[PDB]
Amino acid sequence: HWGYGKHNGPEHWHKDFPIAKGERQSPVDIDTHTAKYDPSLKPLSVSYDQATSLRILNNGHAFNVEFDDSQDKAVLKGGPLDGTYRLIQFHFHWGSLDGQGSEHTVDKKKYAAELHLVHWNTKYGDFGKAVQQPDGLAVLGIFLKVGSAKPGLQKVVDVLDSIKTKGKSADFTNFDPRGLLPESLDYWTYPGSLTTPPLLECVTWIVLKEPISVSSEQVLKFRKLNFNGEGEPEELMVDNWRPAQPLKNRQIKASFK
Ligand SMILES: [Zn+2]
């Protein structure tokens, strides 16, 4: 099936998922000079104090830290959002080298990795129903640069050895996602899609301007993961990012001036 290789990578996805060439695909390059401050944006509200993580899973494309979204605990509100969006999981996209890895780019600049905190609009009842709506999801994107270590990320890094291959999962409770957030909540926002098949166009993207710094050793451990399942030839899980897609008829709005 789909992947990030030469014969099943991003340029091949359109064959099974025609929406890959759609009108609001993600990620996109964020041209900072073209982005415009939007006064209609309300303050962004990230409420993760009640977040309840449950487990971490290597799905063969990345690893997901899943949360219990059966109640309104960890939620994202405000900004360009109408209503409440509930956190369901977060994952990253990274490269084989520090010079690449992020999906969104800033003035064509690629960061070492990108964190995606995925939320679904509670007005739709569940994630499945939400992905059938133009405003069903909200993904908070955060860039990762290599430098000082991110203390709040170490617990994730240290559990990766237990989910090396596709299909493996491990209990991962009491992880606080607040430790992965940068100081500033300044952001860019635009309507887009899931960056992996099925590439559904139900996402309101909120990409933070301030990147978090992680250490070389931390990202190196991300690169030790496998795309393959246990007992199969090793295919390092690196460069699991989709490149920038056509902006088309969209405007990127900034929360700051
Ligand atoms: Zn993602």
Nearest to 113 by CA among 5, 221, 185, 248: 221
Q: Which two tokens stand for residue 95?
A: 């490269």
Binding-site residue set for Zn(2+) = 91, 93, 116
Q: Where do the domains of the chain lie?
A: 1-257
CA dihedral sign of residues 89, 103, 96, 217: negative
Contact 38, 114 (CB under 8 A): no
Distance CA 222, CA 62 (A): 9
Ramachandran assignment for 210, one of left (phi > 0), alpha (psi -120 to 50 degrees), beta (any other): beta
Pairing of strands 203-208, 187-192: antiparallel
- List helix spans (H) across 115-223: 127-130, 154-157, 216-222
Which residues are registered as beta bridge partners of 65?
Answer: 56, 90
- 7 noted as active-site residue: no
CA of residue 37 to ligand 1 center, whole Å: 25
Within the chain, how many helices (H) and strands (E) appear?
3, 15
Max distance between CA atoms of the chain, in angstroms, equals 54
State how far the alpha carbon of 140 is from the alpha carbons of 115, 134, 247, in Å: 8, 17, 19
Catalytic residue, candidates 33, 61, 104, 119: 61
Which helix (H) or strand (E) segment holds residue 115: the answer is: strand 113-121
**Residue 63 alpha carbon to ligand 1 centre in Å:** 10
- Pairing label, strands 63-67, 85-94: antiparallel
CATH code reported for the domain at 1-257: 3.10.200.10
CA terminus-to-terminus distance, the chain: 44
Give this entry's resolution in angstroms. Answer: 1.5
Which among 109, 65, 67, 99 has a CA at the least distance from the CA of 219?
Answer: 99
The 10 Å Cβ neighbour count of residue 176 is 13
Sequence-distant (6+) residues with CB within 8 A of 63 are 56, 57, 91, 92, 160, 163, 225
Residue ranges of the annotated binding site are: 91, 93, 116, 195-196
Distances (CA, A) of 249 to 78, 86, 246: 24, 28, 9
Nearest CA among 253, 107, 129 for reference residue 202: 129
